Design a protein around this nucleic acid. Structure first.
Lengths: 55, 69, 138, 120, 97, 126
RNA sequence: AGGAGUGGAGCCUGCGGCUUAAUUUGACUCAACACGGGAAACCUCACCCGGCCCGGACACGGACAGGAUUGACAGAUUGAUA
RNA sequence: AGCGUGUGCCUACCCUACGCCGGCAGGCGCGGGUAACCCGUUGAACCCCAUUCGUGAUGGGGAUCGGGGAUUGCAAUUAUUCCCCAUGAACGAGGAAUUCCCAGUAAGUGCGGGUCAUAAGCUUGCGUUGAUUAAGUCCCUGCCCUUUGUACACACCGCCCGU
């Protein structure tokens, strides 16, 4: 059953619970500051987000 | 003083119920590795204890060359 | 108005409120050579052996001395006393006497006015620190 | 909803990037150039700078209506709290987005690549 | 297809009453932030409308994990050709002059 | 020889005579593990143990039981009673004794066997 | 004519062929080898002791009231409250 | 110390103060913080200090490896988890073969971030203690600027000669 199985012994370290918000991919995730992008998509969109390379 | 004694060497220990007295020295390493019960319980951690392997499991090939040599 | 820069060095600071008052001989409020770390305790005894007892009867320097680090907190007391004498003499009589005691103190040692600019530098790529690199295999 | 300043700024940047990408692939055929967002008390405007605005607004402002509806329904804006406009860019020849799109549509539309690129 | 029919009829009714939506690209997910509270569990509802627009005769517009659907004349034409319900049940598209 | 006493304690009553000392004379290693809490699926090993202890009298091991389950037992003293466990690809049993508190029930499977050694030559091997 | 920090004196991982089942996919000089942000019990594992749920717009063979999919620890499968 | 992190839109898996007192992180309560506001003047700290060696296999540094209460994890053992009793560790400069490095640098040392459930022996940063050597050269390994030779141009891992 759905309610007899869900959240029984908790997924307190779920790794398949997150994905890139742009490409639905699970590796290279950047969860810092709530970005939730993979590192490649973040490098693609960093200038638009507001991160810039000063040093 | 009825203090629960965490100051001693071996509480809960096998081969003497209370903190009693036993004779002859030169055996402290043996007293920290009780050879009878581990051998009789047929344990693989028993082979760790007895063969000289790592009952906790330090890594041995180059590092961890002190501990079984 | 109020001109007050007190003494500071590296990290530590001896806030030196200069005004008229008792002005007894005290470092951290404590006696002449009595500081607990016991390492650099002579640095203040030197000048007061030249002028006399009358000269420090009206110079209250109330110091808030905060900061960990010997080379910081020490070597800041010398800066603080140099500035105290400088300001006192400049404001009261003339800058010629300030010229003279500042001359002896500063030409005596350069390192009051100058601090060490050296500071920990940034860590870089592919290495345990700033300059070291990770071992390269072949 | 209370959120930290770092997270708020990062989420604002994420919203700008997602909106830019969405309407880029939506109306790049209409000479899309850029988007700007102005957040002011009760007024959150989205300005779409594009070379041609005839199809960006469409007829009777149909396309602008659909864009506002989809943006509001996706990003959770309050109903009627976001109004997105569309204004022309004075100098189309100094935007690499517009000119790269123009070169793409000259290449797709049929032209020698050297001729299209030299015209651009 | 992995779809029931009762929720299917309910989702056709909901799609009639709304018409233009934006959806995320999930299949087995019953917790979608912007498409909850339809008196029906959200898994069947959300996948149901995704399949309603993704039969093979209606277009889409999608990226950044989100489906965008605007009511073109293909949407209305397929409405006519498949459901055979005339638009005299007035949709949300005949307003805002 | 003759039977050796269990620290002079009495096991005649399950609760009043014995199991009074949760930690008084009993060590760690399932001192708190038994008190971690409870879940489902826990009582099946104990049920099979009660079957294998009731249907089968002592001095006579029961039929083969082969399950992996590694569980928490509110008691780690189980005299005349063992959990015959299938581990790896094979089965293992250990002769139990009424001196149990101070160890685990899963540390008896040798799984770190010396893996196969090759014959490196042709090139340089040191 | 310099040295300092010793891959062997004070905590593991990546990779290259073979125990019935393990040395689990790209990369092999610098410019591969805690690199794939790759610290994999499930989940993105896919050399795992055996497998079950689903697939269908285009031409298709068996042309519909059961043609059985996932919920019992007990007298069982080599694990498996399928 | 300083760099930083920290929670109710799928984050009901945030950072924690204070009181639980078996001996302090801690399973129970009760508060603070969407943060220069609370953790925090950064919750079992460095270097130092008559536990002390007037010399050195000792007190001076950890040789497998057992306990007292367990941070609380579908397993942990087939990677989570916390001070100590002196039974000695080749206990004081290291096979050919080599890597990195010029001052707040090497090295020692710990602390954050990412990964993440506190998840690190990884990496990415940050401080803290803090040097020995050198201000040179083209010997090795290579690079660049010129002249020169070439039978090479797939460019010397080239071309090519004779049983």
């Amino acid at each position: 059953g759905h309610q007899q199985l869900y959240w029984s012994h908790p997924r307190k370290f779920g790794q398949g619970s997150r994905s890139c918000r742009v490409c639905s991919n699970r590796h290279g995730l950047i969860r810092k500051y709530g970005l939730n992008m993979c590192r490649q998509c973040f490098r693609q969109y960093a200038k638009d987000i507001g991160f810039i390379k000063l040093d | 003083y009825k203090i629960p004694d965490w100051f001693l060497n071996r509480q809960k220990d096998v081969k003497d119920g209370k903190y009693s007295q036993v004779l002859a020295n030169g055996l402290d390493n043996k007293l920290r590795e009780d050879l009878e019960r581990l051998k009789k319980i047929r344990a693989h951690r028993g082979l760790r204890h007895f063969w000289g392997l790592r009952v906790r499991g330090q890594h041995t090939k180059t590092t961890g060359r002190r501990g079984r040599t | 108005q109020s001109v007050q820069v007190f003494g500071r060095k590296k990290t530590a600071t001896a806030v030196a409120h200069c005004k008229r008052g008792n002005g007894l001989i005290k470092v951290n409020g404590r006696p002449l050579e009595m500081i607990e770390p016991r390492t650099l305790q002579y640095k203040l005894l030197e000048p007061v052996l030249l002028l006399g007892k009358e000269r420090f009867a009206g110079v209250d320097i109330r110091v808030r001395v905060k900061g960990g680090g010997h080379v910081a907190q020490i070597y800041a007391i010398r800066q603080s006393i140099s500035k105290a004498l400088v300001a006192y003499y400049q404001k009261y009589v003339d800058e010629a006497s300030k010229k003279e005691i500042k001359d002896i103190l500063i030409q005596y040692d350069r390192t009051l006015l100058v601090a060490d600019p050296r500071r920990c530098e940034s860590k870089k790529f592919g290495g345990p620190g700033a300059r070291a690199r990770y071992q390269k295999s072949y | 909803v209370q959120i930290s300043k770092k997270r708020k700024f990062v989420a604002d940047g994420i919203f700008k990037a997602e909106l830019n990408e969405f309407l880029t692939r939506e109306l790049a055929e209409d000479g899309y150039s850029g988007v700007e967002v102005r957040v002011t008390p009760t007024r959150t405007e989205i300005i779409i700078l594009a070379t041609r605005t005839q199809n960006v607004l469409g007829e009777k402002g149909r396309r602008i209506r659909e864009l506002t509806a989809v943006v509001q329904k996706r990003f959770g804006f309050p109903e009627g709290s976001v109004e997105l406009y569309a204004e022309k860019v004075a100098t189309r020849g100094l935007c690499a987005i517009a000119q790269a799109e123009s070169l793409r549509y000259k290449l797709l539309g049929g032209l020698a690549v050297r001729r299209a690129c030299y015209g651009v | 297809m992995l779809m029931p029919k009762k929720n299917r009829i309910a989702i056709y009714e909901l799609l009639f009453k709304e018409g233009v939506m934006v959806a995320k690209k999930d299949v087995h997910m019953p917790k979608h932030p912007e498409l909850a509270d339809k008196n029906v569990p959200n898994l069947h509802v959300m996948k149901a409308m995704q399949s309603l627009k993704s039969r093979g005769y209606v277009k889409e517009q999608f990226a950044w994990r989100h489906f965008y659907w605007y009511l073109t004349n293909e949407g209305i034409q397929y409405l006519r050709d498949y459901l055979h319900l005339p638009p005299e049940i007035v949709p949300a598209t005949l307003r805002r002059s | 020889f003759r039977k050796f006493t269990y620290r002079g304690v009495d096991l005649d009553q399950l609760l009043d005579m014995s199991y009074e000392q949760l930690m008084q004379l009993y060590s760690a290693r399932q001192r708190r593990r038994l008190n971690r809490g409870l879940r489902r699926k826990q009582h099946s090993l104990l049920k099979r143990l009660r079957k294998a202890k009731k249907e089968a009298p002592p001095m006579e091991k029961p039929e083969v039981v082969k399950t992996h389950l590694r569980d928490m037992i509110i008691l780690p003293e189980m005299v005349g009673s063992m959990v015959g466990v299938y581990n790896g690809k094979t089965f293992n049993q250990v002769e139990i004794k009424p001196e149990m508190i101070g160890h685990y029930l899963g540390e008896f499977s040798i799984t770190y066997k010396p893996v196969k050694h090759g014959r490196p030559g042709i090139g340089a091997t040191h």
